[PDB]
Amino acid sequence: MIVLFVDFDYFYAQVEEVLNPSLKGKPVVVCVFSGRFEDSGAVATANYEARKFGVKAGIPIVEAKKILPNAVYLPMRKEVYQQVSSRIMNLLREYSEKIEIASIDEAYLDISDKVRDYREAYNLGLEIKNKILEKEKITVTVGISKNKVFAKIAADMAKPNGIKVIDDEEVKRLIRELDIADVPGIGNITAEKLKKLGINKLVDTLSIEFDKLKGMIGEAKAKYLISLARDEYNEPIRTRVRKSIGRIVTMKRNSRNLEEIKPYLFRAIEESYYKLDKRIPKAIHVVAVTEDLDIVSRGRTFPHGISKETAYSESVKLLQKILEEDERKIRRIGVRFSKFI
DNA sequence: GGGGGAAGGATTT
DNA sequence: CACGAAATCCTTCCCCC
Ligand SMILES: Nc1nc2c(ncn2[C@H]2C[C@H](O)[C@@H](COP(=O)(O)OP(=O)(O)OP(=O)(O)O)O2)c(=O)[nH]1
Ligand SMILES: [Ca+2]
Ligand SMILES: [Ca+2]
Numbered sequence: 001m002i003v004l005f006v007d008f009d010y011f012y013a014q015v016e017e018v019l020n021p022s023l024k025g026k027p028v029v030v031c032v033f034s035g036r037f038e039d040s041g042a043v044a045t046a047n048y049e050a051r052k053f054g055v056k057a058g059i060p061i062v063e064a065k066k067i068l069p070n071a072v073y074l075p076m077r078k079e080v081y082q083q084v085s086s087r088i089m090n091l092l093r094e095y096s097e098k099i100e101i102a103s104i105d106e107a108y109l110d111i112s113d114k115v116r117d118y119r120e121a122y123n124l125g126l127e128i129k130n131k132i133l134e135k136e137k138i139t140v141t142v143g144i145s146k147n148k149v150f151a152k153i154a155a156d157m158a159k160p161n162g163i164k165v166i167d168d169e170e171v172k173r174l175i176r177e178l179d180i181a182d183v184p185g186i187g188n189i190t191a192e193k194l195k196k197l198g199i200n201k202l203v204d205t206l207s208i209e210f211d212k213l214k215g216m217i218g219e220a221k222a223k224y225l226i227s228l229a230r231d232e233y234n235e236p237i238r239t240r241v242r243k244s245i246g247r248i249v250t251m252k253r254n255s256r257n258l259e260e261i262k263p264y265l266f267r268a269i270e271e272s273y274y275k276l277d278k279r280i281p282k283a284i285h286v287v288a289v290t291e292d293l294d295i296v297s298r299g300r301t302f303p304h305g306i307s308k309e310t311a312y313s314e315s316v317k318l319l320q321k322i323l324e325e326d327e328r329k330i331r332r333i334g335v336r337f338s339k340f341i
Numbered sequence: 342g343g344g345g346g347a348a349g350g351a352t353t354t
Numbered sequence: 355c356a357c358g359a360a361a362t363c364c365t366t367c368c369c370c371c
């Protein structure tokens with residue numbers, strides 16, 4: 001079982017770079033301006049020239065402006081990146097059929113066939129990096145191991161613009177040397193729940209009774225960590241398919257006024273439908289980010305599809321339902337459509 | 342007891 | 355201060371064999 005993971009480097013930043021070469025070399029920060037005030041918003045991502053000074057995805061634009069005032073700040077253009085991504089995903093098909101597109105810039109290729117050992121894998125890794133750097137002028141980091149989880153950790157260790165093979169000899173030492181927090185799927189919250197159990201490496205999972213672990217982190221993730229530590233993880237690569245579409249927007253001000261909110265909620269629906277393009281959804285949820293970044297949502301599943309007019313009608317009710325309960329002001333508002341016909 | 346759908350959340354990338 | 359989008363998993367509630 002040989003898995004090849006491809007991760008496009010500082011993707012958005014790099015695309016903006018590609019589209020305007022003069023930018024290369026300078027510190028670039030791709031932003032998402034909320035429009036509340038001046039420079040309100042957050043960082044979608046940044047290139048390494050900015051990354052090394054602490055400017056990273058998540059921080060407010062204002063905190064980034066404070067660290068690197070003379071860096072280039074571009075608005076985020078999601079659509080563009082999307083089409084550059086897909087074109088690259090096509091070039092990857094010319095190397096395998098068994099492909100899983102995890103995100104806008106991640107992909108696992110099952111190449112157990114077209115190879116047989118790692119020496120001929122590290123080669124296909126270079127055939128792919130170079131191929132991509134050529135047709136689209138974009139650098140990627142390749143990771144190669146026996147399963148998706150390790151294929152990915154490989155890339156993490158080798159980025160940016162790198163390639164790495166995690167055979168088996170080392171997979172053994174990693175199950176003991178790797179910090180549990182650096183395991184895909186283990187977030188900050190899960191990483192911390194694992195300290196209170198004495199789990200600081202994968203191996204420590206074998207030392208704990210399964211039930212005390214299922215109670216702390218749930219069964220799924222428990223069976224996940226164990227399988228990996230017990231070195232028998234083998235999830236397959238498969239074609240993932242869109243299950244939901246949506247959009248959440250930020251309001252210029254926080255409010256509880258229905259008539260003051262409806263315009264944002266409607267614009268969200270309008271955009272969601274544009275993206276739905278031909279897909280008919282049976283389920284709708286109205287999501288809201290309260291005044292203290294807490295996520296609230298209400299929904300309804302219908303026996304039939306949902307016409308645009310129905311959606312308008314329903315969303316207004318679901319929002320009212322939200323204001324009925326939570327007495328907190330609303331900062332962000334949006335919708336999501338699922339259960340397509 | 343346990344299937345199976347719903348809904349509202351939690352957590353991760 | 356602190357945007358966005360989508361997946362999976364969890365706990366709870368419910369109708370009913
Ligand atoms: N709006 C927004 N976009 C994000 C965020 N994190 C990642 N993205 C987007 C833009 C990133 O270029 C893209 C790929 O994510 P990583 O692959 O997580 O980001 P990036 O490629 O810059 O770093 P990397 O190549 O993985 O070392 O996803 C985020 O927190 N907010
Ligand atoms: Ca990544
Ligand atoms: Ca990446």
Ligand SMILES: [Ca+2]
Nearest residue numbers: 181182183186
């Ligand atoms: Ca992690």
